[PDB]
Amino acid sequence: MDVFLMIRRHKTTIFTDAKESSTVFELKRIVEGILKRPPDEQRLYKDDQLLDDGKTLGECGFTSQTARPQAPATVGLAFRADDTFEALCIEPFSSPPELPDVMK
């Protein structure tokens, strides 16, 4: 089954899909084709949990019920540049205004 994700780093969000049975490494190959960084230069996270290459997306907790087209799951992304390992940093999106009185 398909899982729908948002791969996020700083102010960049990639919208992509993969199978529940596909691995973290295969997801890194998708990011490679878009951002041109090989898998060994990438670290993927679920919240603050670093994701292991050999694990399937389903084993990471990305299922059809938690990673939907209309409500994708967030995958955090940090780059390694040789001896450099940046801290995982995802910039939050903006906030809507306060709900108007006529909508309460």
Partner 1 sequence: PRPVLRSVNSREPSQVIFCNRSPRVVLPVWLNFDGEPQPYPTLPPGTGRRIHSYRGHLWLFRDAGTHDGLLVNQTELFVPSLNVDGQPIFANITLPVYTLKERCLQVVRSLVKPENYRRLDIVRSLYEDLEDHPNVQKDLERLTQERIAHQR
Partner 2 sequence: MMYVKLISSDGHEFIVKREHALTSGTIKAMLSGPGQFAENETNEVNFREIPSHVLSKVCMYFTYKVRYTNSSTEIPEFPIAPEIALELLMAANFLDC
Among 11-19, 20-28, 38-46, 54-62, the segment contacting partner 2 (CB under 8 A): 11-19
DSSP assigned state of 71? B
Residue 46 near residue 55 (C-beta atoms within 8 A): no
- Strand ranges, E, within 20-97: 42-46, 49-50, 73-81, 84-85
- Binding flag, residue 72, partner 2 (CB under 8 A): yes
d(CA 90, CA 52): 20
From residue 84 to residue 103, what is the string marking binding to partner 1 with x (rule CB under 8 A)?
Answer: ----------------x-xx
**Which residue ranges make up the site for partner 2 (CB under 8 A)?**
2, 4, 6, 11-15, 17, 34, 68-72, 91, 93-97, 99-100, 103
**Which residue ranges make up the site for partner 1 (CB under 8 A)?**
100, 102-103
